[PDB]
Design a protein around this ligand. Structure first.
Ligand code: NAD
Ligand code: NAD
Ligand code: L34
Ligand code: L34
Lengths: 292, 292
């Protein structure tokens, strides 16, 4: 029997910490932090995630606004709005919820957010700084993943990690953080990391996952990770979010099988999800204190 | 018997290509490209590598200057020089040979070179763009490594690659290029990539290298890769440079053992080295054409 790690309980801890930090920033005479979120269009999951973010902000004492725009907004208009928010000193953190309409170039939009306000860590400079193991705004999900590992007390240094997924927002940063030097300006995990993706044959995925002390799945494929792929005692972190069949939410991991073989496992929901939102809270206070 | 790939012969091909490109740029009325190299101090290997670079430039029709400064140069003075070269339009490519004296912060210096002239690809924006699979100035050694693989006709897509070394100038870019999507703006190799480093136990290094179709060693450890670590038919690319014992130059690979087990192997010297210099030539014409 795997220890089922509650990301909900961890996220509550992290939110207690942020509330304190925030209550102590404000207590000492500084402006309350303010997070602005641009939400374009009518995607329900997008609306639900933004709502989780604004509730979390309210519970740790961070002001938030949700700026709603229709999917018909031009790229030029959204960029204008971004420039206006970058230049407002009341605004500490700025994120644009993805995905955006097809007619809008997401890379351009992310690179328009000011790096000092880029609480998603998607701006190219934040990406470059992370890749160079310098202080940066880390993306929220990857940082959530590392915090689950670190706060549970699961070792990384010299350990074998497999990451299924190579996406610039999730997979790549997870791999980058976990493999890098603990002695650098931004310390990494010092793990031996294998990056797998859509062209990794299932056969080769299994031959690597079977050596792994930690397996992190961020592919968006149900049952991609099964018991026979895991060594006994492994930590299994499920970042996937998959709508399957009424519509239902599952992870990338066969939870019921793998919970009999792994030492640690995260559920979906209730695992990495809440951690994603908590770490965003942390980045907002960091942007407000202007410590980068 | 492994095919011993001559990086010398490949580099000559690449240099023939660059000469043509350059002869055709100039032929059409543009300024001859100009590469400036700042060399600080008296390190002999540094002097020898810069000399390889300026000879290569002369053979492909690129003007070069070597700017020599003493190890006593302040950081402020070197940065001044860099600003002056950034702002001169005769100068197309600008690199600072590393390493620098301890009193100088290399990250600051690399980030002062203008991205459009950063023919080493060390500037944070070039690093960020590479990490996001966008067009960037690629670092010369990593690109050399990928060119050896691609020009020999060794497949990467779906293949297992191990990289021994995680350095921001060599190991990390090699891993990044090889793992990434062939369908992105800057195409990657679509390989399954394992990053190993100084905290990977030898035991775990072997268990991954033994699955590898390609093993790329960039650790600076003699005999780090031996025959029993390699599967039969594997491609073995030796990026290491090690002074051993008169003083002698060897790679990270036990060449004599591994040439009996691998399908392909690169020697040291004569492998990745000349490729490092040729690809720098390629980046110089790219900076001159202002195509990024
Ligand atoms: N829980 C959270 O907080 C959270 C946050 C962000 C994203 N996600 C989820 O993580 C998953 C990935 O999100 P993303 O934005 O990185 O998505 P994406 O669709 O860009 O990435 C999918 C990645 O998985 C890889 N992949 C596809 N098939 C594979 C296979 N057979 N083996 C290994 N890798 C394979 C792809 O190569 C790609 O890199 C999704 O299910 C998404 O909903 C969860
Ligand atoms: N042929 C060329 O053109 C060329 C160009 C650049 C560098 N190099 C050579 O490549 C080697 C590395 O250069 P660098 O600048 O990346 O050096 P570096 O010293 O910064 O990097 C060494 C890397 O190897 C790793 N390492 C150390 N012990 C290890 C082990 N037992 N297993 C796996 N990895 C281990 C370290 O963690 C580190 O990431 C050196 O020998 C250098 O001279 C060659
Ligand atoms: N700019 C930007 N930043 C982000 O960090 C994200 C983004 N866009 N778009 C989509 C992803 C996904 N994501 C996210 C956030 C929260 C949760 C979450 O709270 N999950 C819960 C509820 C599951 C549900 O009912 O949908 C869970 O327990 O897993 C899931 C994804 C998120 O916020 N993402
Ligand atoms: N800024 C900057 N850019 C670089 O790309 C480098 C740098 N600094 N500092 C050191 C590394 C190493 N390096 C390099 C360049 C050429 C050769 C090379 O030509 N090697 C030959 C000769 C070996 C010898 O006799 O020393 C070989 O055949 O391997 C080796 C390393 C190089 O140029 N490097």
């Amino acid at each position: 029997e795997a220890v089922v790690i509650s990301g909900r309980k961890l996220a509550q801890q992290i939110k207690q910490e942020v509330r304190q930090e925030v209550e102590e920033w404000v207590a000492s005479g500084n402006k309350r932090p303010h997070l602005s979120v641009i939400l374009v269009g009518e995607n329900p999951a997008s609306h639900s995630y933004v709502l989780n973010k604004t509730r979390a902000a309210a519970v740790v004492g961070i002001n938030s606004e949700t700026i709603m725009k229709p999917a018909s907004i031009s790229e030029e208009e959204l960029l204008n709005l971004i420039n206006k928010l970058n230049n407002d000193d009341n605004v500490d953190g700025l994120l644009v919820q993805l995905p955006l309409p097809e007619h809008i170039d997401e890379r351009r939009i992310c690179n328009a957010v000011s790096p000092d306000k880029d609480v998603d860590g998607f701006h190219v400079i934040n990406v470059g700084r992370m890749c160079l193991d310098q202080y940066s705004m880390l993306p929220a999900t990857p940082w959530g993943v590392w915090e689950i590992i670190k706060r549970t007390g699961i070792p990384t240094l010299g350990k074998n990690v497999v990451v299924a997924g190579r996406s610039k927002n999730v997979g790549m940063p997870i791999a980058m953080l976990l493999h890098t030097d603990g002695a650098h300006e931004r310390p990494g995990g010092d793990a031996t990391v294998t990056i797998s993706h859509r062209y990794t044959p299932k056969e080769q995925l299994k031959k690597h996952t079977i050596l792994a002390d930690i397996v992190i799945s961020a592919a968006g494929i149900p049952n991609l990770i099964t018991a026979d792929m895991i060594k006994e005692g492994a930590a299994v972190i499920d970042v996937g979010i998959n709508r399957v069949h009424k519509p239902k939410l599952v992870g990338d991991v066969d939870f019921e099988g793998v919970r009999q073989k792994a030492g640690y496992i995260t559920p979906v929901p209730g695992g990495v999800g809440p951690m994603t939102v908590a770490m965003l809270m942390k980045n907002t206070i960091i942007a407000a204190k202007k410590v980068l």
